[PDB]
């Protein structure tokens, strides 16, 4: 353990990302969520249950990123400045998780929230997903953890993030959408940075080991992809929106792969998103 010197930087990216993530600081209290109450009241029962089940699911995975995800990456930092950025990432994962509770508190009835929580506990595809991710976090290979993390938030999360972006384009729950855009803005930098360090870590291992990890990543991606199709089908079962959610999943999967330095795998047909969703994103 050495005394950190922020005026002796080894990798310029450490300072750039530190500065970006810190000055991007936000709290769920900054967003006037209570203004979405009238728009919430106009939703059907199906749409209400779906929203609550989406966020109860996202709370689990962000808690996982808070407690196990980001802490597990810390021992494998290349610079001391990298350790400090991962400390921020960890805390912001708690802010992410905390802000989903702000939504339930403002909009929803306690009885329905607990029902949605109990639904997420019983949901097999969700639990299978969370067990795969943390299996790699508890593992001994530092590079597989960095893959698992990028896949989780740069790709898997977007099965749930689709919903508020859809509501946004319809002019409903606009403040909740503003909240989610702050999370998404965090996660783009999280994926970029962890993906970047993945590539830096690969620059000190043999070429044969690199190819072994490339085969692993694409196998893991397809494994999680097949499981997420099942998760989408169970969530959006009461709606006719599943195919559109699946399109949005393939679109981000490509970005997740590009964070790690690999080419996009999913072709135009599969990754063709409804333009209103992309418009709500930008």
């Amino acid at each position: 353990i050495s005394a950190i010197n922020w005026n002796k930087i080894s990798d310029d990216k450490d300072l750039e990302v530190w500065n970006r993530l810190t000055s991007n600081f936000w709290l769920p209290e900054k967003v006037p969520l209570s203004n979405d109450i009238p728009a919430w009241q106009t939703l059907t029962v199906v749409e209400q249950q779906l929203t609550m089940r989406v966020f109860t699911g996202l709370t689990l995975l962000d808690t996982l990123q808070n407690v196990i995800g980001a802490p597990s990456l810390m021992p494998d930092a290349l610079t001391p400045h990298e350790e400090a950025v991962l400390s921020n990432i960890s805390f912001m994962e708690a802010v992410h998780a905390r802000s989903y509770s702000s939504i339930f508190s403002t909009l929803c009835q306690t009885k329905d929230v607990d029902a949605a929580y109990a639904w997420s506990e019983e949901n097999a595809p969700l639990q299978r997903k969370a067990q795969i991710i943390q299996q790699h976090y508890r593992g001994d290979d530092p590079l597989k953890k960095k893959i698992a993390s990028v896949f989780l938030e740069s790709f898997l999360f977007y099965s749930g993030f689709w919903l508020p972006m859809y509501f946004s384009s319809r002019g409903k729950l606009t403040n909740t959408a503003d909240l989610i855009r702050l999370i998404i803005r965090d996660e783009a930098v999280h994926g970029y940075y962890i993906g970047y360090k993945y590539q830096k870590n690969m620059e000190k291992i043999s070429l044969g080991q690199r190819e072994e990890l490339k085969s692993f990543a694409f196998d893991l991606l397809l494994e999680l992809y097949d499981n997420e199709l099942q998760y989408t089908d169970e969530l959006y079962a009461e709606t006719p929106w599943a195919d559109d959610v699946k399109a949005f999943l393939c679109y981000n999967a490509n970005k997740a792969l590009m964070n790690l330095g690999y080419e996009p795998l999913f072709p135009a047909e599969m990754a063709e998103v409804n333009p209103a969703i992309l418009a709500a994103l930008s």
Partner: protein, 128 residues
């Protein structure tokens, strides 16, 4: 001819390696400056985050504020991430609005297969 900058993450670098078209890179080392003697389209990544002007990378500015290189600039293509909301491709329209050259394309990270096909068809049609 294409002129581009890419960081140590090399997202834009891998777009141009997969583009196939002849290109020259703006040096990562800030002390090293390059000169270009032909008209070009500039491909640049965005590093804004928000709206505090600093969307264009520092090495690109030093390339552009040189009168010799600026004159031969004909168009600009921006890269970035849609997750940055309104700030997606902010470096593109900042160079465009200032220099007076048109903003041509807007792509994410390494660029999709669609993007590469769109840029190939776009570049040839631009010189026409």
């Amino acid at each position: 001819q294409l002129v581009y900058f890419s960081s140590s993450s090399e997202n834009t670098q891998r777009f141009i390696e997969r583009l196939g078209l002849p290109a020259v890179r703006i040096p990562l080392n800030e002390r090293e400056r390059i000169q270009v003697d032909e008209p070009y389209i500039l491909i640049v990544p965005s590093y804004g985050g928000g709206g505090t002007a600093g969307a264009v990378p520092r090495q690109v500015i030093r390339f552009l504020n040189d009168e010799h290189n600026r004159a031969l600039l004909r168009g600009v293509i921006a890269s970035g991430n849609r997750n940055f909301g309104e700030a997606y491709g902010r470096a593109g329209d900042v160079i465009a609005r200032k220099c007076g050259v048109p903003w041509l394309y807007r792509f994410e990270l390494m660029g999709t297969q669609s993007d590469i096909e769109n840029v190939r068809k776009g570049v040839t049609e631009f010189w026409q």
